[PDB]
């Protein structure tokens, strides 16, 4: 029977496996080592080398610990490289515990309020699974971070210093997720039942207050107001009093948020370039800015990614860190393992066979702060992590060109380097997206 | 092994049998997000002991792989969706049936080369030495996977029932429920699930 | 140039290599692994599982540490076990530390002895050399255990503990050693001047009298009265008086040191079957028993083994124990690799080839416990290490039969398990064995 693996299917596999060459010794090899250890290809660590004609100066890394916050550390990353060029503080961090309570605690409304939207659906309808499977957790986008900052600003790193769970966010989001879900119950409880919008709204508002609570009892109460004292780099003290998240950030880092444009690559037969697009229910901040990616080719792509980085600006990007790397060496290389020459077989996908099949996603946001450009093209990138400075060359990565056509996703690039007809695109679509599904692979979460 | 094996091969006919449908539909989707894991359930092991019996722990070891299998279901992952895409593909081509089984057969072989590099060759034949509690020795030659299970073993696999307490509305008790596309073992015994009051 | 290697061998070479099969996969593997991790065979794994049809009791192991008393741990191993099980003391040890003593001493004036004796050859012969260049060791042989059990006897453990030196002897052999070849110019200063037999015997005397204290602050105090007192393994408590180490030695033990012979399998063209060996200058106790090494065939040596092992007595044995071996594990098997096949090269030399060429010799003394006979033939030995419980099978390691073939050279064997012909060889041969050089492999110290 041909859909059953039989014996004589058995005896054939068994001989193709001995007729491979070297089947013997490769086998023990990967068997003692695993793959990675056996695959993995010192030409690439070669090539690899930390050298890179476009570099900024962005000091020393931060490190997540054990959460999902990897697109707030590098946003957040983004910003305070500006405030320690422009005031001179070296190694100055923002709070990422403040964006991560304000996203939290967003994110809990936001939900109640999808789950409002979906509460005449049924329970077991894929966007209601959707919603339920994942209420909420760590990941986000751009657009997402901007709206935190927009509404609540940013703090300095010691006026809101981690703790416990926001560096180990495992029972945070547990805890958190069975509320919002025993929650979820009691909201479609009520629109069945033929609910008030006032009598829905007070028990959002008594649900909420309970989650206010878990989240300042896990991360603390946010700063309202504060005095900033520090020393420059040329040693001079300094004193700014009674700031607020707000005038901290319209001061130290003075951007407008409306001057960046989410780019995306996906080169899938929905997503035609040179569009808008967004991902249904997707977000954080109920009335704040929605997620908008303009998909275009990857040369257009890459190329405003180095014309920022040669104006001097450090630009977040979205990949896919697990795919061919090496991620305590930090090296990002299609060349870093041969493994269709180690096993015999063809491994490869086009970038668009691995979004439509499943195979790959922005799972982690970075910080792209260099570029080495030999005759003109770019041969790899340096990249900020958040994972601390024992990985990598002092938490510094590197990703070679090839590996960035591949497996990045997204870069955030400063509306002014843009070509006017991507200007034009932008304010003619921004209220018309085309609206991808929630389960888009460029809705995913990083 | 044989999990990882049969599933790789259950997930090509999932495809298949799916091929005609969207790939934005959801069971398709379903299917790639995880074309094979890890994890099981009862009457999954029991379909792979069937088919397989089963070995002393000593005859076949451990690697680093079974023990940290977070690399090759990576790759294997890798492998079944890109097979994925050209099963689709032959299905849309109209390929006869011949040509997709020669193709899921090319497919398996490599299959079974990643898993037997992984996770070494399963043995066929080995002998059994021991000392009992007693401190006798004991030797028992030229055993087989299902000799072995048969004599040291010796269970009947149709004895045993799954049962669950699953108290939603949908799941009404004393009754058998199965689980759609769910299983490893192509022609073997399928998922029955017993629900009963706790 | 046929003598130079240039640049068309070169290119030839890697020529054969890129024709090498999976020669880019292979090299990877070994790149990133090294060779043992690459090459570990599994098979061998599975085929040597510690499972033994004649099994000893033998209990726990002990632990010579940092130093090469491989040879004193194997002996006391023997005598300790015929203790445990006559006396009933589960796990009882005899001090090694003890043997050590005696063994560095006699030694310091074994080599005296030895320099006085080639004084008139010149310092560059080969001998002269020899000598100097390992005054002494901490290795040695049956035969020169047996010499300081008759002179010395034997304490428990308790009675005369390990101290730094002896479980690290590495700064005693240097000092001692810097010592030694200080006095060697000395006597061979005196034997030059024409110094009298007793002003060279009054040197030489307070020579020792310094070795002496080396020995006595860095190993302590030989004991020569004791007390034992213990408990046995039915709990009933035992005190035995004022006992020496030779007392102890007679009561405790009670063998008749004359009862063993030292057997080697040695294939080789200079060494004939069925007669007496002995090496050149190889000693410790002047005056007392000298080294005689019966070579046999490897059928017959190992005959022997098995019928003293039947008999329920260990076996003291000498082997190459770096040779194709894991340590961790403590797998002794010829396919515990597979380096032929992984460097598509083959590297097979016979037993003789690689005596004769340096390649192997007894580097280590362990001791037999148990043998797995399957249709009457050997297929794995059990062996009793002395490097503590975490390696091997709580110090135990596992031996196959092809590996005892080729690395086994010496077992220690009661007579009384000898054919009267070979008993006869014996006691003809006994006062004019064949002297073997020096530097002969079965000269080598475990």
């Given at each position: 029977m041909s859909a059953e693996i039989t014996s004589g299917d058995l005896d054939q596999f068994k001989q193709d496996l001995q007729a491979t060459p070297a089947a013997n010794a490769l086998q023990k090899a990967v068997m003692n080592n695993g793959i990675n250890a056996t695959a993995e290809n010192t030409d690439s660590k070669v090539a690899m080398?930390?050298?890179?004609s476009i570099e900024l100066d962005t000091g020393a890394v931060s490190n997540q610990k054990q959460s999902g916050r990897c697109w707030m550390f590098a946003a957040l990353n983004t910003m305070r490289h500006g405030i320690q060029a422009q005031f001179k503080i070296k190694d100055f961090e923002l709070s990422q515990n403040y964006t991560f309570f304000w996203d939290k605690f967003e994110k809990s409304n936001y939900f109640y309020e999808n789950v409002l939207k979906t509460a005449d659906q049924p329970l077991d309808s894929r966007k209601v699974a959707f919603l339920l499977a994942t209420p909420q957790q760590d990941g986000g986008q751009w657009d997402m971070l901007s709206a935190l900052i927009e509404k609540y600003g940013i703090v300095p790193k010691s006026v809101m210093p981690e703790t416990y769970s926001s560096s180990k966010s495992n029972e945070l989001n547990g805890l958190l997720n069975l509320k919002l879900r025993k929650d979820a119950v009691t909201l479609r409880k009520l629109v069945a039942d033929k609910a008030s919008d006032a009598d829905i709204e007070a028990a959002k508002q008594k649900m909420l207050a309970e989650d206010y609570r878990i989240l300042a009892y896990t991360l603390g109460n946010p700063p309202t107001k504060f005095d900033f004292e520090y020393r420059d780099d040329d040693k001079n003290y300094h004193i700014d009093r009674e700031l607020t998240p707000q005038t901290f950030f319209k001061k130290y880092v003075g951007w407008n948020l409306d001057d960046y444009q989410s780019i995306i690559n996906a080169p899938t037969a929905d997503k035609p370039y040179k569009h808008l697009y967004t991902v249904e229910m997707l977000g954080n901040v109920v009335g704040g800015r929605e997620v908008r990616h303009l998909n275009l080719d990857i040369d257009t792509f890459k190329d405003l990614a180095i014309k920022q980085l040669k104006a001097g600006e450090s630009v977040w990007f979205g990949s896919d860190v697990g795919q061919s790397s090496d991620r305590q060496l930090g090296i990002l290389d299609t060349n870093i393992y041969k493994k269709d020459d180690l096993f015999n077989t063809d491994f490869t996908m086009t970038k668009a066979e691995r979004l439509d099949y499943g195979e790959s996603l922005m799972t982690h946001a970075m910080v792209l702060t260099g570029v080495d450009l030999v005759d003109g093209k770019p041969t790899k990138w340096k990249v900020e992590n958040?994972?601390?400075?024992?990985?990598?060359?002092k938490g510094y990565f590197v990703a070679s060109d090839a590996w960035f056509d591949q497996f990045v996703y997204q870069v955030v690039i400063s509306k002014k380097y843009l070509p006017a007809e991507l200007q034009d695109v932008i304010k003619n679509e921004y209220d018309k997206p085309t609206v991808l599904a929630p389960w888009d692979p460029m809705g995913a979460l990083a």
């Amino acid at each position: 029977m041909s859909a059953e693996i039989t014996s004589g299917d058995l005896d054939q596999f068994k001989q193709d496996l001995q007729a491979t060459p070297a089947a013997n010794a490769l086998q023990k090899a990967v068997m003692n080592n695993g793959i990675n250890a056996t695959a993995e290809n010192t030409d690439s660590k070669v090539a690899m080398t930390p050298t890179f004609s476009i570099e900024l100066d962005t000091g020393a890394v931060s490190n997540q610990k054990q959460s999902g916050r990897c697109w707030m550390f590098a946003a957040l990353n983004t910003m305070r490289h500006g405030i320690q060029a422009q005031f001179k503080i070296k190694d100055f961090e923002l709070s990422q515990n403040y964006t991560f309570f304000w996203d939290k605690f967003e994110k809990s409304n936001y939900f109640y309020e999808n789950v409002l939207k979906t509460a005449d659906q049924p329970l077991d309808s894929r966007k209601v699974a959707f919603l339920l499977a994942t209420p909420q957790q760590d990941g986000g986008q751009w657009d997402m971070l901007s709206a935190l900052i927009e509404k609540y600003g940013i703090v300095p790193k010691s006026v809101m210093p981690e703790t416990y769970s926001s560096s180990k966010s495992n029972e945070l989001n547990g805890l958190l997720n069975l509320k919002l879900r025993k929650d979820a119950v009691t909201l479609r409880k009520l629109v069945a039942d033929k609910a008030s919008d006032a009598d829905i709204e007070a028990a959002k508002q008594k649900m909420l207050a309970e989650d206010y609570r878990i989240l300042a009892y896990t991360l603390g109460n946010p700063p309202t107001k504060f005095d900033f004292e520090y020393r420059d780099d040329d040693k001079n003290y300094h004193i700014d009093r009674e700031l607020t998240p707000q005038t901290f950030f319209k001061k130290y880092v003075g951007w407008n948020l409306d001057d960046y444009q989410s780019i995306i690559n996906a080169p899938t037969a929905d997503k035609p370039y040179k569009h808008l697009y967004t991902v249904e229910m997707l977000g954080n901040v109920v009335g704040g800015r929605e997620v908008r990616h303009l998909n275009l080719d990857i040369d257009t792509f890459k190329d405003l990614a180095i014309k920022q980085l040669k104006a001097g600006e450090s630009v977040w990007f979205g990949s896919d860190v697990g795919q061919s790397s090496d991620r305590q060496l930090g090296i990002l290389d299609t060349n870093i393992y041969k493994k269709d020459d180690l096993f015999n077989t063809d491994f490869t996908m086009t970038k668009a066979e691995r979004l439509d099949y499943g195979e790959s996603l922005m799972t982690h946001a970075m910080v792209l702060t260099g570029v080495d450009l030999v005759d003109g093209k770019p041969t790899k990138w340096k990249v900020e992590n958040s994972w601390g400075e024992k990985v990598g060359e002092k938490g510094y990565f590197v990703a070679s060109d090839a590996w960035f056509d591949q497996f990045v996703y997204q870069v955030v690039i400063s509306k002014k380097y843009l070509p006017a007809e991507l200007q034009d695109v932008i304010k003619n679509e921004y209220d018309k997206p085309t609206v991808l599904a929630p389960w888009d692979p460029m809705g995913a979460l990083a």
